[PDB]
């Protein structure tokens, strides 16, 4: 029957390939994709033809001038179609070669090409938290309808049927990602029952943004299979329940070398000064998450400390004791555009004075 | 149990083959098929025996003179029975060798054999849109019964459980088709939730028609497996919801060579003059689709433009900028007979003056 | 679909590994785990990097000083993720290298390193009994809701649908454990319908504790898959229904050699004197189990005998008739921390006089 | 069985009475009630004993000083218990005779006792709109779960099963209210499917506030019976669906006498000047309702007109043509405290200059 | 519980009355109603105050000039609210006293006031056929979903569970109507399973129209209670299944007196000449019903005969044999506006020459 067809091995019959072009839609938060057949395997992004789609249907163009252009930027193996088929992360342009307003990759690319940044070779590990929800009722997975599970406490990194909801989805994603070639560093059950996390491990500059988006694309496709819905809303349930963020861990060449801890403090300092303008691009709805309770710092103050999950930035015990490592900006929400957060951190930390 | 039997590998036990003869029924819109055993593998259509069926049961013949004859025309691998078994696309005739009124392949074959057409070597890519429906209630897949989903917008090329209904079926079909040997160029989720699309990529003359029909046959067989119903009705739900069409993309030898864009304009021009008579054969119910809203042009006007999804014909940005390519006739409905549309375009575009 | 992704073989695509760090949480009875990617296979515990987690979320640290450190101590193969992926049993410390109050491995390690203990090379076989419960109602698997099955009698080591509930889970676990490298000696259906047992066979000193914990981790993960709940509560149902214990079988070098039976009696003797203080660490709720009925001895008396399941300690017919073997301390409850019971027995039996 | 007991006629057995004391709770939007037995029928409010309740449980007092006092203010017949039993609308005070912060009846009473207001003898008709919701899912009655009914249009004052949801409840309420002695002037199905309205007809000064609250109490008690939930949230569903308000119709002695239309215009004028401060007390969430679409006027502008449902105030065709009547302030939300809106209008309209 | 409240007898507690004003909405086919309280019983229409409603919500007025006026024209007892409560049939006007375009009572009233018509004192019996449908699926009551019952034949005037669907509703209606004061002459099960009929017996001129509308109002309210949907669509199911009409039986003074049969033939004759223009106002969709099969006459021909259910007009055996009676115009569809058909027959039959 149905899975025999979806899992057909094509290699036995043609050289042809299926490429799934992924892009980001009109809201800056919606992933979209379509697929095309290509005549043979491809490993280099610049050897893939450009393409277009109906921008008038994604809120990015008018009906009379509907075409919007897709620039292939990164290739990953398609864990769904398997064999030689591929996912292609994309960039969006007018037919005139202008990047459209919702393309935030272009700006970020410039910052990561700019040679004083490139030389610092920044590293990002981003911690994507999300929440799983029952289709149609829109209530968190594992929660009874019109009710709540036991209070927070046993859920964080837990095991068992009354504690841990949807490991299925999570472990699936983890391998999918690995197979695809995403640098995924690890996963964990989070504090609010039904909330999970994966980390896209230390990735350089632009490719961090690319990998987080593709990882999210894979997550949602998996949840789609499962008949479950994901939100990246930073505070999906009001009251005594954790919000969800996208912690950004960060380091520069000079931060991970001898006496980098000094560079770290100095970077934090610069961040303190540009808190206000960082918050503004750190994803919407954040006001509902950053309250000072539930392992956040208040939106209005900026703070930092060592093992302090109540602070705006946190520095690992390990990197303190070694005088070198990385720090964690805990401010960005789970619905953060990594392109924006990732480059803005480099900019406020290297370029600006 | 049941799938062990349906998936038996016959190769281990005989040389014998199963051929599924497919034809088009009395309404010109209903596919029909039966199967026979053949003594060994066959790769050439003319080496398959002709056959007959009970036309009195498909509305094509009377009871007392019931026999109607099947001419094998194209072979494809059967993605259901797998191994060496085959699908055989067919043509319909009286025992006297007359093509029956519902055989539109014969006319089309003549036009594509006619040497001034053949030399121009026309190319067609056809975009089959369709809609998936819940068995028995006849309401679109994923829609709640006696109600509607959220308004159009997030569905086009979307991902996730609350957005994307029946990817299962779609991805299955895609591989099925590839395996079978249909030149299928790509797929995508369409604008109305539950509506999808596949494209039968650039195919020459008569074989375009053959492949579209066989692709439709595979689609409906898959939906059958799934316990879901397909309509090719061009406007299945009334009101603020997309209709479904069968866009025909077209090019001639001279159109894809240097300065073909001029030939394109001239062809469009000829099309403008024969709009009235094209509409008449562009599938029934089209009046309900072509309204000027929802990415169509009004039935009564003819128009064209560059990236204009509101026009009767559209010319890609890419082919404009290259002075050579193809244009898209957006007029045909999803229930179009590709034999009719495909040849009628060649006729109005090459032969007539 | 979903199990195709969870069962992806990673070996075909990278050298990378997934390690699941397991630890024991704030209540001393809750297992917790998270996973990370490592660059290649690892077989030695000391070659695994140390790690940390949010102790503020497991009741082990404050929010402002939240980091707690994980020391890898034992590696086993992950029977879930399979291939080269691993489970890593852990130990808990402050960033200052202090063992936290809930780390009972550290104390036990000292006792088993201490050279007069090491030389006696103690052996432990521990019999983990547990009960399976329906999710949400929290009533034993196979029991009708708000009611009881037939009285005890046909359930112990039974077979058939009306007698034996959840063998599925049990047999799964058994192989899981073997695969993982736990020395699991055997399994059996227990006396109360829905209650089962596995034995972690003769294991030396500290590794007994390690293996029991990891075996429990595997059990609960399996039940999680099954949509069923486990309790290690020593007496889950009040009345005429068996409780659950963690019998510890024990032997020293000198006990299993010629005329060890004398050493056995002498050990029992020492145990009689420290009954009071053993009970106190033999797991909470034990008062509800050890009643003198249902194959226990009363908490307040200490007793021993030969084939006597009504005594506090029991000595096998086999080891009596051979003048050498091991004895069974039937006192510990099913929710016993094996680190505590296992070393406390060595201490009261070798060191103290 | 159960309704035989609930409907027992007590008259046949004692003179005793049951009085249900109703009051308004800590949030200023939550009705609360408890019942006591009284020795014989009572018709005058001042002949009912005062009472108290646990304010610490309604967010109105601390635990150590928990008593809050209830002043009977209005009697109505209890339509649930029937016979001679009564509902008693209440007022809230400290034991020291201070009105508590959430008692808005006291202020309003003062304004309606103040002799220049009393002499003008103001009249209020208030139009309570509300929405009916499915228990637990919190989605509007008659809507399919995770979906929407047909667009607005056939619902307003409609009849039939596919159009009209919960008439049951509505018609019940209507008679309940009449029986009770509420001056209820009429009912109607509103624009958004599942939304209804009742009017508390022309009532003088303080008693308008009293009757609206008691009418709301009766409504919710009825929906409680039905196993359905009510919201007075002014905009329960986002998007192309009506919000809900509490239109206040108003007239003074001088407005309903010869050439009152002049007094009306002058009153409107005064209202224009105090729009800002009226909005602030016209119920919370109003920003989400008053948008200028769906028969509201934008929160930021003030406007008036004759038959204009798009304006902030509307004057009936009937009262224009007669040079005398009443005008409709369409600004208050459905969650308005009538005590506050009702007196504030008298104050801005008579006292202030 | 709920029916105790809906059936409260108000007479025991006030003199007050509930009046349900009914009118016809923007489509000319949708009934609408709302209710008001009146101070005492009323028996004469002209003693009821006029009223208004929001025409902007029924498609009859703009938002800025929203008021539309209701003229009470006929009173009937409300069979739902019972006691002294009343239904009030209405007429629609601008505030300027113009009848709105959808008010067809005004025209008809003129024709029935015009003294040469009045003197002929026309009589109408109209046969309302309708179909009952399952809510949400919109498939006829008693039909299995996605299928059909046995072929027509045993359904007409049938009895039994496999033959007769919804008698409940029907018998309820019948008494309701009688109670209300509608001159309802009789009922019967019709030919297509799930289709019924009632007749509004011999009623004079304008009051026929009034009574048919109010009868329809009562029908749909009843079906609403039942959780069932009604259509007056003339041909709800395509194929071998009866359509639904609104046969109009007609007689004038001179037709029911000695040798009226001559006047009858002459009237028929006049009708033959104005068939074309009668058809145009005889309700929309009629083309799908009037086919010449299933007891209709073809739309394009006009015919008459004696006991002929295949003709456009039919004359009873009884009135033929008596040389005096009435004839049956079988042409109007079930969705006919009786005001239009009823007066148009008088006009073509008396006034015009
Ligand atoms: N030097 C570094 N610079 C930037 N990121 C790093 C560095 N070292 C490790 N990381 C990344 O930071 C991430 C932190 O993940 P996790 O263990 O969830 O963080 P936390 O415990 O702070 O929540 C991992 O992706 C890791 O790849
Ligand atoms: N040069 C050509 N001549 C005719 N058909 C072509 C030509 N080039 C491409 N096609 C086909 O026409 C189809 C276009 O489909 P699609 O990608 O859906 O276009 P749209 O932008 O209208 O969605 C594809 O099959 C494409 O391969
Ligand atoms: N000499 C020994 N020292 C420690 N454990 C032993 C020794 N001999 C056997 N065992 C173990 O004791 C356990 C046997 O448990 P089990 O069959 O449940 O005992 P019983 O059923 O008699 O109460 C297993 O751990 C077995 O591997
Ligand atoms: N003179 C008056 N002054 C104040 N309110 C009045 C006066 N006359 C009537 N009312 C009341 O105002 C309320 C408006 O009800 P309704 O007819 O539903 O309003 P709308 O037409 O705005 O829906 C009713 O209670 C009506 O009886
Ligand atoms: N002289 C008349 N004029 C008008 N209607 C009449 C006259 N005599 C009887 N009727 C009525 O005509 C209607 C008859 O419809 P019905 O009994 O269903 O007839 P059929 O057998 O034509 O279906 C009823 O209102 C009946 O009372
Ligand atoms: C549990 P936590 O300590 C806090 C993050 C939290 N889920 C949030 O509100 O951002 O996450 P992590 O940073 O260890 O992943
Ligand atoms: C979304 P669309 O732009 C328009 C097709 C539409 N479903 C129709 O009504 O013909 O499809 P395509 O051009 O990407 O083929
Ligand atoms: C029959 P049993 O003695 C069961 C022991 C009992 N569940 C308990 O409460 O100790 O089995 P074994 O493990 O001792 O062989
Ligand atoms: C039809 P409407 O104008 C509705 C206005 C709307 N429901 C709202 O206040 O938001 O109410 P009413 O005045 O007829 O009661
Ligand atoms: C039996 P019939 O011809 C039914 C009318 C038929 N269903 C139609 O299409 O008009 O009418 P009657 O019994 O009501 O006169
Ligand atoms: Mn983390
Ligand atoms: Mn986290
Ligand atoms: Mn973190
Ligand atoms: Mn397309
Ligand atoms: Mn399309
Ligand atoms: Mn197209
Ligand atoms: Mn045992
Ligand atoms: Mn046991
Ligand atoms: Mn034992
Ligand atoms: Mn109103
Ligand atoms: Mn209203
Ligand atoms: Mn109003
Ligand atoms: Mn009849
Ligand atoms: Mn009839
Ligand atoms: Mn009739």
From Swiss-Prot, chains A, B, C, D, E:
Membrane-spanning residues: none
Keywords, ordered alphabetically: ATP-binding, Cytoplasm, Ligase, Nucleotide-binding
Subunit note: Homooctamer.
Tissue-specific expression: Found in all the tissues examined with higher expression found in tissues of the root.
Pfam family, one: Gln-synt_N
Protein purpose: Plays a role in the flow of nitrogen into nitrogenous organic compounds.
Enzyme Commission code: 6.3.1.2
Protein known as: Glutamine synthetase root isozyme 3
Gene Ontology biological process: glutamine biosynthetic process
Class in the EC hierarchy, top level: ligase
SMART domains, per the entry: Gln-synt_C (SM01230)
Domain GS catalytic: start-end pairs: 104-353
Localization per Swiss-Prot or TrEMBL: Cytoplasm
Secreted in keyword set: no
One GO cellular component term noted in the UniProt record for this chain: cytoplasm
Leader sequence residues: none
Keyword Ligase belongs to the record: yes
Similarity remark: Belongs to the glutamine synthetase family.
InterPro entries, alphabetized: Gln_synt_N, Gln_synt_N_sf, Gln_synth/guanido_kin_cat_dom, Gln_synth_cat_dom, Gln_synth_gly_rich_site, Gln_synth_N_conserv_site, Glutamine_Synthetase
Catalytic activity entry: L-glutamate + NH4(+) + ATP = L-glutamine + ADP + phosphate + H(+)
Domain GS beta-grasp as annotated: residue spans: 17-97
Main location: cytoplasm
Gene Ontology MF terms in the entry: ATP binding; glutamine synthetase activity
Annotated gene: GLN4
